[PDB]
Amino acid sequence: MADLELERAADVRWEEQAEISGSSLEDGAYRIKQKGILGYSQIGAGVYKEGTFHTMWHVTRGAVLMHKGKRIEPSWADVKKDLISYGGGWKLEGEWKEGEEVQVLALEPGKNPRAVQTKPGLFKTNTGTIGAVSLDFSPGTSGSPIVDKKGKVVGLYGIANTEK
Numbered sequence: 001m002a003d004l005e006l007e008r009a010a011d012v013r014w015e016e017q018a019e020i021s022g023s024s025l026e027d028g029a030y031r032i033k034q035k036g037i038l039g040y041s042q043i044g045a046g047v048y049k050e051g052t053f054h055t056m057w058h059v060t061r062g063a064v065l066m067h068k069g070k071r072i073e074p075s076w077a078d079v080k081k082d083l084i085s086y087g088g089g090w091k092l093e094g095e096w097k098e099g100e101e102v103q104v105l106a107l108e109p110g111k112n113p114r115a116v117q118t119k120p121g122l123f124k125t126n127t128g129t130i131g132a133v134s135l136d137f138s139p140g141t142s143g144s145p146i147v148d149k150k151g152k153v154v155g156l157y158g159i160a161n162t163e164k
């Protein structure tokens with residue numbers, strides 16, 4: 001059994017003094033890490049909202065997560081959408097405007113969380129237009145929350161559904 005733990009990185013809030021363009025228990029953004037022979041390694045990032053932990057399916061792979069002294073366990077997942085919810089139903093209902101700029105709360109493995117302001121690329125699909133946020137970030141940054149102006153989470157770094 002892999003030893004997967006989550007660690008709180010910071011609060012999830014829109015950053016006003018944020019850098020624009022592209023230079024590349026408790027609510028918040030958590031690093032997802034598993035213990036190794038050398039030490040922990042960061043495989044993903046997760047969002048804690050309304051007592052439910054949201055992350056990419058590929059990061060967790062369905063494995064049980066250790067938070068504090070309590071084991072937090074999966075409730076729902078979608079392998080096609082690469083989404084997994086722990087302890088409750090999916091709580092992130094936030095949608096992108098389709099025109100407004102967004103901030104990515106990045107969590108590079110071994111780097112301070114930073115907010116980066118960027119405009120997602122818009123591409124058509126059979127299920128309706130979608131916004132793509134792609135930047136030069138490590139794989140361990142996967143699941144990093146993408147927030148709108150209101151500060152709600154509109155996507156996870158990996159893919160940003162837009163409703164208008």
Ligand SMILES: NCc1ccc(-c2ncc(NCC3CCNCC3)nc2-c2ccc(-c3ccoc3)cc2)cc1
Binds near residue numbers: 080083160161
């Ligand atoms: N592993 C990265 C990854 C990125 C996007 C998808 C993905 N693939 C296909 C897809 N088709 C749209 C279906 C929606 C349900 N009805 C049938 C069509 N959608 C996605 C995708 C969509 C939204 C998110 C997302 C991220 C954070 O909140 C929602 C993630 C993936 C899968 C993996």
